[PDB]
Amino acid sequence: LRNGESDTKRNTQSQNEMNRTGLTKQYLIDNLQKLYSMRDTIFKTYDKECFLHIW
Amino acid sequence: LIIKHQMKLHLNELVDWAWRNGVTSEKFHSNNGSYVIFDHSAVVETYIINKNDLFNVTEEIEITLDKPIDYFLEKDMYGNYREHFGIAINDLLFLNTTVNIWLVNDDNSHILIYKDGKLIDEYMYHQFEYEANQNKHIYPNNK
């Protein structure tokens, strides 16, 4: 006559960490056309208000 | 070793228990004032015993390594807990690593009976104290 007994305890602890980055640049001609007058638009507001307008 | 346990039994359970553990003549009372009377192990009188009426009865169980136990729980040294039914304490195959044995009391209560290789009455439960004799020293007085 043979008897027995068993017992187990498995305990796992884990940690993860993921750092994903990216950078996508799209070149379109439509952006160059809109680029043209960004700087010039600054001084249209200066000229309209601050300066004289008759020769 | 005698273990006393108080339990609450309805009328049917009370009658079964009383006839199982012979009672000659005595009156059991309940919460709602209802009572039952046994006289020469016969139910002579009952007084308005509704359902869900709890009769409180004390019960004495003799505990001994040879005598079998209805339902007990054993804890080894490592930490494993097991439960056994209808087996005497000496009957356990592995008493070498059995550290504690409680008696499950049908109320889910637990009563310690076996502690570290001995019955609970034989164990002595040493307290703690630092070892030292009497001081027997004369001290100066501040008065």
Side-chain angles (χ1 to χ4, degrees):
Chain A
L1 163 59
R2 191 196 334 267
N3 303 38
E5 187 165 18
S6 303
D7 188 348
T8 60
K9 294 180 176 57
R10 183 179 57 80
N11 154 275
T12 68
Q13 331 183 304
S14 147
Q15 293 182 6
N16 304 337
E17 174 158 8
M18 172 87 77
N19 291 355
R20 216 53 261 166
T21 73
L23 181 163
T24 302
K25 313 189 311 185
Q26 326 173 20
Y27 304 71
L28 318 176
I29 276 175
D30 305 341
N31 274 357
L32 253 68
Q33 301 178 354
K34 311 214 291 169
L35 188 32
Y36 192 15
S37 62
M38 311 275 258
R39 297 205 177 181
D40 215 10
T41 308
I42 308 277
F43 305 111
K44 290 181 181 172
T45 51
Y46 278 111
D47 193 358
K48 145 63 151 173
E49 322 198 19
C50 299
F51 285 83
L52 199 63
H53 291 271
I54 168 155
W55 281 51
Chain B
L1 182 64
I2 304 308
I3 296 312
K4 258 151 159 278
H5 174 255
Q6 173 144 0
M7 60 207 318
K8 314 198 109 45
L9 320 152
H10 297 93
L11 182 122
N12 53 345
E13 282 152 78
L14 170 61
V15 158
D16 168 18
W17 178 94
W19 283 345
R20 206 78 61 112
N21 316 338
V23 278
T24 70
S25 165
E26 71 156 49
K27 174 157 71 175
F28 298 85
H29 296 279
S30 56
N31 305 359
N32 307 5
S34 54
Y35 64 74
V36 75
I37 295 185
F38 296 84
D39 164 332
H40 292 109
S41 100
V43 188
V44 177
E45 274 174 37
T46 88
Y47 177 78
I48 306 207
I49 307 172
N50 304 290
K51 304 302 161 203
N52 62 66
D53 251 15
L54 301 163
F55 298 83
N56 47 346
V57 174
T58 205
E59 167 202 65
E60 282 144 300
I61 322 160
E62 155 150 295
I63 301 303
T64 278
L65 304 96
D66 325 287
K67 168 177 288 336
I69 309 297
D70 304 88
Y71 186 6
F72 65 97
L73 191 150
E74 79 143 324
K75 162 191 170 182
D76 310 1
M77 37 205 286
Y78 315 107
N80 305 1
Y81 291 82
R82 307 177 179 282
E83 27 196 35
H84 310 260
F85 309 87
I87 286 179
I89 296 181
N90 262 15
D91 188 331
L92 307 168
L93 290 179
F94 317 85
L95 266 162
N96 162 26
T97 69
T98 283
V99 168
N100 293 334
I101 298 188
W102 304 271
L103 155 72
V104 159
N105 204 324
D106 159 356
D107 264 20
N108 315 356
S109 305
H110 278 224
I111 304 189
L112 211 178
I113 57 178
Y114 187 81
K115 213 275 195 184
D116 263 5
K118 300 180 180 177
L119 270 191
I120 194 42
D121 57 19
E122 272 152 50
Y123 198 88
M124 212 42 79
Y125 266 125
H126 280 120
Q127 279 287 160
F128 182 90
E129 32 182 70
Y130 315 109
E131 71 306 352
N133 327 296
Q134 295 212 346
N135 225 336
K136 264 162 142 62
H137 191 289
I138 293 314
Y139 288 89
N141 208 42
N142 309 356
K143 82 104 180 180

Short mmCIF file of all heavy atoms in Angstrom, two decimals, chain B residues 1-6 59 61 63 69 71-73 89 100-115 120:
data_model
loop_
_atom_site.label_atom_id
_atom_site.label_comp_id
_atom_site.label_asym_id
_atom_site.label_seq_id
_atom_site.Cartn_x
_atom_site.Cartn_y
_atom_site.Cartn_z
N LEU B 1 -8.80 14.57 26.75
CA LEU B 1 -9.04 15.88 26.15
C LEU B 1 -10.52 16.04 25.82
O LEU B 1 -11.09 15.22 25.10
CB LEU B 1 -8.18 16.06 24.90
CG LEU B 1 -8.28 17.40 24.18
CD1 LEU B 1 -7.76 18.50 25.08
CD2 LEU B 1 -7.51 17.38 22.88
N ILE B 2 -11.13 17.09 26.35
CA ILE B 2 -12.55 17.37 26.14
C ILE B 2 -12.68 18.72 25.45
O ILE B 2 -12.15 19.72 25.94
CB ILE B 2 -13.33 17.36 27.47
CG1 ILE B 2 -13.14 16.03 28.19
CG2 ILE B 2 -14.80 17.61 27.22
CD1 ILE B 2 -13.44 14.82 27.33
N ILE B 3 -13.39 18.74 24.33
CA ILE B 3 -13.64 19.95 23.56
C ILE B 3 -15.12 20.29 23.66
O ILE B 3 -15.97 19.45 23.34
CB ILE B 3 -13.21 19.78 22.09
CG1 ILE B 3 -11.70 19.55 22.00
CG2 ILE B 3 -13.61 21.00 21.29
CD1 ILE B 3 -10.89 20.53 22.80
N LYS B 4 -15.42 21.50 24.10
CA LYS B 4 -16.79 21.96 24.25
C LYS B 4 -17.12 22.93 23.13
O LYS B 4 -16.40 23.92 22.93
CB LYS B 4 -17.00 22.63 25.61
CG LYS B 4 -17.70 21.76 26.63
CD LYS B 4 -17.28 22.12 28.04
CE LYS B 4 -18.29 21.64 29.05
NZ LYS B 4 -19.44 22.57 29.17
N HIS B 5 -18.19 22.66 22.40
CA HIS B 5 -18.60 23.53 21.30
C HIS B 5 -20.08 23.87 21.42
O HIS B 5 -20.91 22.98 21.60
CB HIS B 5 -18.33 22.89 19.94
CG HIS B 5 -18.87 23.68 18.79
ND1 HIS B 5 -19.99 23.30 18.10
CD2 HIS B 5 -18.46 24.84 18.23
CE1 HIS B 5 -20.24 24.18 17.14
NE2 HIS B 5 -19.32 25.12 17.20
N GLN B 6 -20.40 25.15 21.31
CA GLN B 6 -21.77 25.61 21.34
C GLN B 6 -22.30 25.77 19.92
O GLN B 6 -21.63 26.36 19.06
CB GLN B 6 -21.88 26.94 22.10
CG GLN B 6 -23.25 27.58 22.03
CD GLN B 6 -23.61 28.29 23.32
OE1 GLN B 6 -22.84 28.30 24.27
NE2 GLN B 6 -24.80 28.88 23.35
N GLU B 59 -22.11 20.98 23.27
CA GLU B 59 -21.78 19.61 22.91
C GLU B 59 -20.35 19.32 23.33
O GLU B 59 -19.44 20.12 23.09
CB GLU B 59 -21.96 19.39 21.41
CG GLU B 59 -21.35 18.10 20.89
CD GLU B 59 -21.07 18.17 19.40
OE1 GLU B 59 -20.22 18.98 18.99
OE2 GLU B 59 -21.71 17.41 18.64
N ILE B 61 -17.13 16.82 22.97
CA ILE B 61 -16.49 15.83 22.12
C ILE B 61 -15.17 15.43 22.77
O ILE B 61 -14.37 16.29 23.14
CB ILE B 61 -16.24 16.38 20.70
CG1 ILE B 61 -17.41 17.25 20.25
CG2 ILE B 61 -16.03 15.23 19.72
CD1 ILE B 61 -17.06 18.18 19.11
N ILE B 63 -11.56 14.06 22.42
CA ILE B 63 -10.54 14.04 21.38
C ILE B 63 -9.37 13.21 21.88
O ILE B 63 -8.86 13.43 22.98
CB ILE B 63 -10.09 15.45 21.00
CG1 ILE B 63 -11.28 16.27 20.50
CG2 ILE B 63 -9.01 15.40 19.95
CD1 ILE B 63 -12.00 15.64 19.34
N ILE B 69 -11.88 11.14 14.14
CA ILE B 69 -12.42 12.49 14.14
C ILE B 69 -13.31 12.66 12.92
O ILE B 69 -12.98 12.18 11.83
CB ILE B 69 -11.29 13.54 14.15
CG1 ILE B 69 -10.29 13.25 15.26
CG2 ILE B 69 -11.86 14.93 14.33
CD1 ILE B 69 -10.89 13.33 16.64
N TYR B 71 -14.16 15.45 11.18
CA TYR B 71 -13.66 16.35 10.15
C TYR B 71 -12.56 17.22 10.74
O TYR B 71 -12.85 18.10 11.57
CB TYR B 71 -14.80 17.21 9.59
CG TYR B 71 -14.46 18.09 8.40
CD1 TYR B 71 -13.22 18.02 7.79
CD2 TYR B 71 -15.39 18.97 7.89
CE1 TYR B 71 -12.91 18.82 6.71
CE2 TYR B 71 -15.09 19.78 6.81
CZ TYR B 71 -13.85 19.70 6.23
OH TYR B 71 -13.54 20.49 5.15
N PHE B 72 -11.32 17.00 10.32
CA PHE B 72 -10.24 17.81 10.85
C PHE B 72 -9.38 18.33 9.70
O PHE B 72 -9.51 17.90 8.55
CB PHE B 72 -9.40 17.05 11.88
CG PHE B 72 -8.65 15.88 11.33
CD1 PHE B 72 -7.32 16.00 10.97
CD2 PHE B 72 -9.26 14.65 11.19
CE1 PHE B 72 -6.63 14.92 10.47
CE2 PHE B 72 -8.57 13.58 10.70
CZ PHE B 72 -7.26 13.71 10.34
N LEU B 73 -8.50 19.27 10.04
CA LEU B 73 -7.65 19.96 9.08
C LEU B 73 -6.22 19.91 9.58
O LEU B 73 -5.96 20.16 10.76
CB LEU B 73 -8.11 21.41 8.91
CG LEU B 73 -7.54 22.25 7.78
CD1 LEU B 73 -8.57 23.26 7.35
CD2 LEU B 73 -6.28 22.97 8.22
N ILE B 89 -6.22 10.62 14.33
CA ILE B 89 -5.00 11.42 14.16
C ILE B 89 -3.79 10.52 13.97
O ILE B 89 -2.90 10.80 13.16
CB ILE B 89 -4.82 12.38 15.34
CG1 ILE B 89 -5.97 13.39 15.39
CG2 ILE B 89 -3.50 13.12 15.24
CD1 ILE B 89 -5.86 14.39 16.51
N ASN B 100 0.41 21.20 12.60
CA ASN B 100 -0.78 21.60 13.33
C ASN B 100 -1.98 20.81 12.85
O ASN B 100 -2.06 20.42 11.69
CB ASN B 100 -1.06 23.09 13.17
CG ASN B 100 -0.01 23.95 13.82
OD1 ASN B 100 0.66 23.53 14.76
ND2 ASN B 100 0.17 25.16 13.30
N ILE B 101 -2.92 20.57 13.77
CA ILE B 101 -4.19 19.93 13.43
C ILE B 101 -5.30 20.63 14.20
O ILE B 101 -5.29 20.65 15.43
CB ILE B 101 -4.21 18.43 13.73
CG1 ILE B 101 -3.16 17.69 12.91
CG2 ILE B 101 -5.59 17.87 13.47
CD1 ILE B 101 -3.26 16.19 13.02
N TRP B 102 -6.26 21.20 13.46
CA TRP B 102 -7.47 21.79 13.99
C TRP B 102 -8.65 20.88 13.68
O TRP B 102 -8.59 20.02 12.81
CB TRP B 102 -7.72 23.18 13.39
CG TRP B 102 -6.60 24.13 13.57
CD1 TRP B 102 -6.41 24.97 14.62
CD2 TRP B 102 -5.51 24.35 12.67
NE1 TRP B 102 -5.26 25.70 14.44
CE2 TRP B 102 -4.69 25.34 13.25
CE3 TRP B 102 -5.15 23.81 11.44
CZ2 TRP B 102 -3.53 25.79 12.63
CZ3 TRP B 102 -4.00 24.26 10.84
CH2 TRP B 102 -3.21 25.24 11.43
N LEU B 103 -9.75 21.10 14.40
CA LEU B 103 -10.97 20.33 14.23
C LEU B 103 -12.04 21.22 13.63
O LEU B 103 -12.46 22.20 14.26
CB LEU B 103 -11.43 19.75 15.57
CG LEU B 103 -12.91 19.42 15.75
CD1 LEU B 103 -13.29 18.19 14.96
CD2 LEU B 103 -13.22 19.23 17.22
N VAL B 104 -12.48 20.91 12.41
CA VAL B 104 -13.48 21.73 11.74
C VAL B 104 -14.83 21.39 12.34
O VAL B 104 -15.23 20.22 12.38
CB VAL B 104 -13.46 21.49 10.22
CG1 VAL B 104 -14.78 21.91 9.62
CG2 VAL B 104 -12.32 22.27 9.59
N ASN B 105 -15.55 22.41 12.80
CA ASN B 105 -16.61 22.21 13.77
C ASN B 105 -18.00 22.40 13.15
O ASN B 105 -18.94 22.75 13.86
CB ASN B 105 -16.39 23.17 14.94
CG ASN B 105 -17.05 22.70 16.22
OD1 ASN B 105 -18.13 22.12 16.22
ND2 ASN B 105 -16.35 22.92 17.33
N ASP B 106 -18.12 22.24 11.83
CA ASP B 106 -19.39 22.15 11.12
C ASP B 106 -20.02 23.55 11.08
O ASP B 106 -20.88 23.83 10.23
CB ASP B 106 -20.24 21.06 11.80
CG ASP B 106 -21.76 21.14 11.55
OD1 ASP B 106 -22.15 22.13 10.89
OD2 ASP B 106 -22.58 20.34 12.02
N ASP B 107 -19.50 24.47 11.88
CA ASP B 107 -19.84 25.88 11.79
C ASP B 107 -18.80 26.66 11.02
O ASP B 107 -18.88 27.90 10.99
CB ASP B 107 -19.99 26.48 13.19
CG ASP B 107 -21.43 26.51 13.66
OD1 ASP B 107 -22.25 25.76 13.10
OD2 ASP B 107 -21.73 27.29 14.58
N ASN B 108 -17.84 25.98 10.41
CA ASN B 108 -16.64 26.51 9.78
C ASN B 108 -15.70 27.10 10.83
O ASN B 108 -14.72 27.76 10.46
CB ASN B 108 -16.94 27.56 8.70
CG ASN B 108 -18.07 27.14 7.79
OD1 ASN B 108 -18.58 26.03 7.91
ND2 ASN B 108 -18.46 28.02 6.88
N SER B 109 -15.95 26.89 12.12
CA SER B 109 -15.02 27.29 13.15
C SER B 109 -13.85 26.31 13.21
O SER B 109 -13.91 25.20 12.68
CB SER B 109 -15.71 27.36 14.51
OG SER B 109 -16.83 28.22 14.46
N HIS B 110 -12.78 26.73 13.88
CA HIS B 110 -11.56 25.94 13.97
C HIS B 110 -11.10 25.90 15.42
O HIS B 110 -10.97 26.95 16.06
CB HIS B 110 -10.47 26.52 13.07
CG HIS B 110 -10.59 26.11 11.64
ND1 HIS B 110 -9.51 25.70 10.89
CD2 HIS B 110 -11.66 26.02 10.82
CE1 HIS B 110 -9.91 25.40 9.67
NE2 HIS B 110 -11.21 25.58 9.60
N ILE B 111 -10.85 24.70 15.93
CA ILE B 111 -10.37 24.50 17.29
C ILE B 111 -9.07 23.72 17.23
O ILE B 111 -9.03 22.61 16.68
CB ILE B 111 -11.41 23.75 18.15
CG1 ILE B 111 -12.74 24.50 18.15
CG2 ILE B 111 -10.90 23.60 19.57
CD1 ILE B 111 -13.73 23.96 19.13
N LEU B 112 -8.01 24.29 17.81
CA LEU B 112 -6.71 23.63 17.79
C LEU B 112 -6.74 22.42 18.71
O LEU B 112 -7.19 22.51 19.85
CB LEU B 112 -5.63 24.61 18.23
CG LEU B 112 -4.21 24.48 17.67
CD1 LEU B 112 -3.35 25.59 18.23
CD2 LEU B 112 -3.59 23.14 17.98
N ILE B 113 -6.25 21.28 18.22
CA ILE B 113 -6.15 20.10 19.07
C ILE B 113 -4.74 19.53 19.05
O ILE B 113 -4.31 18.90 20.03
CB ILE B 113 -7.17 19.02 18.66
CG1 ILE B 113 -6.99 18.63 17.20
CG2 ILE B 113 -8.58 19.50 18.91
CD1 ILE B 113 -7.93 17.54 16.75
N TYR B 114 -3.98 19.75 17.98
CA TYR B 114 -2.67 19.14 17.85
C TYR B 114 -1.64 20.19 17.45
O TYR B 114 -1.81 20.87 16.44
CB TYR B 114 -2.71 18.01 16.82
CG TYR B 114 -1.46 17.17 16.71
CD1 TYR B 114 -1.21 16.14 17.60
CD2 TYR B 114 -0.55 17.38 15.68
CE1 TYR B 114 -0.09 15.36 17.48
CE2 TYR B 114 0.58 16.61 15.56
CZ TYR B 114 0.81 15.60 16.46
OH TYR B 114 1.93 14.82 16.34
N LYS B 115 -0.56 20.29 18.23
CA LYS B 115 0.44 21.34 18.04
C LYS B 115 1.82 20.76 18.27
O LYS B 115 2.17 20.43 19.41
CB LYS B 115 0.18 22.51 18.98
CG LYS B 115 0.56 23.87 18.41
CD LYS B 115 2.03 24.17 18.61
CE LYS B 115 2.32 25.64 18.39
NZ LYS B 115 3.77 25.94 18.48
N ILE B 120 -2.94 19.27 22.23
CA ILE B 120 -2.84 20.66 22.65
C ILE B 120 -2.77 20.77 24.17
O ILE B 120 -2.19 21.72 24.71
CB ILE B 120 -4.01 21.49 22.07
CG1 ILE B 120 -3.72 22.98 22.21
CG2 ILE B 120 -5.32 21.12 22.75
CD1 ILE B 120 -2.30 23.36 21.89
#
